[PDB]
Design a protein around this ligand. Sequence first.
Ligand SMILES: O=C(O)CNC(=O)C(=O)O
Ligand SMILES: [Mg+2]
Ligand code: NI
Ligand SMILES: [Zn+2]
Length: 331
Amino acid sequence: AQNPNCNIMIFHPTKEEFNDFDKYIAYMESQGAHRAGLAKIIPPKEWKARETYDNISEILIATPLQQVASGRAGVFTQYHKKKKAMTVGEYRHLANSKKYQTPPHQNFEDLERKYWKNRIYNSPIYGADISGSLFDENTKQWNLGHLGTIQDLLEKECGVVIEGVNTPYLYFGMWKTTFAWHTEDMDLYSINYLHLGEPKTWYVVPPEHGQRLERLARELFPGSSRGCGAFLRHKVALISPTVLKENGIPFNRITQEAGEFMVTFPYGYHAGFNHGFNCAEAINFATPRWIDYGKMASQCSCGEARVTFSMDAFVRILQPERYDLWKRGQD
Ligand SMILES: O=C(O)CNC(=O)C(=O)O
Ligand SMILES: [Mg+2]
Ligand code: NI
Ligand SMILES: [Zn+2]
């Protein structure tokens, strides 16, 4: 078995190997990459996502989210408070302000310490989930706006044509902006490209150990657990690496820098934070190996998780028994 300790693997494809996305994901899996739950892909030196980022300031963040925490430093939840609209120019200025800027630090490790020590005492503002793309239409390789769609994958594998569309999202981050512990909708893959700015640190639990994370989360968030059998779908809970180590949860960590791709694999729980002003783009995708995970994915039916138009058809076709109850939650 390849990669039995489930370590995060880093790949360096040649320009030739960067042509066929599907084939490269399948190569990574042949080397065991999926066992970790997350892989890093460094693009060939010849490649570029677009010519410059000099003209992005007028993009609108219609609903910036202030991430307010509750709990203790290592075990907390966050809620998203809606703020007034602002442009990317305005947001970048705010990120760089004395109130919100990254503090002086020695290295990534010192910054990670400071994050886990101090995150709960601040409420950073995240420009998340903005429909759109920063890839140039002429970038032919690994263009996240030009991937094969999940609807077409399900049709190719299973023969059923379904409604729905699949488009990328932009994330504008600042220091301490946080992504809570989650897997993707319907335990899909995700791909994330860090277009610009400061790094993003990731934590991941191997898919084969996901249920261990879920059991710990039920213990640490007992009211949430009673309210919903799949409350991590709400994307609000944080558990620190110290806490995971104390409870024997297997995980790994890695920092993504500007110009690098990360891929999350089906049922790979992940969480993390941004080091300072940055812009990432991400999208869900599928492969033939995803189908079985989609069929088994948990669902939130308490009504909190509330998801995209396109998830309807995935539930309807892959989880017909669940469909009725899940849709009650959606309505
Ligand atoms: O970048 C973020 O805030 C969150 N991204 C992801 O969870 C992802 O790409 O799967
Ligand atoms: Mg602009
Ligand atoms: Ni994700
Ligand atoms: Zn729920």
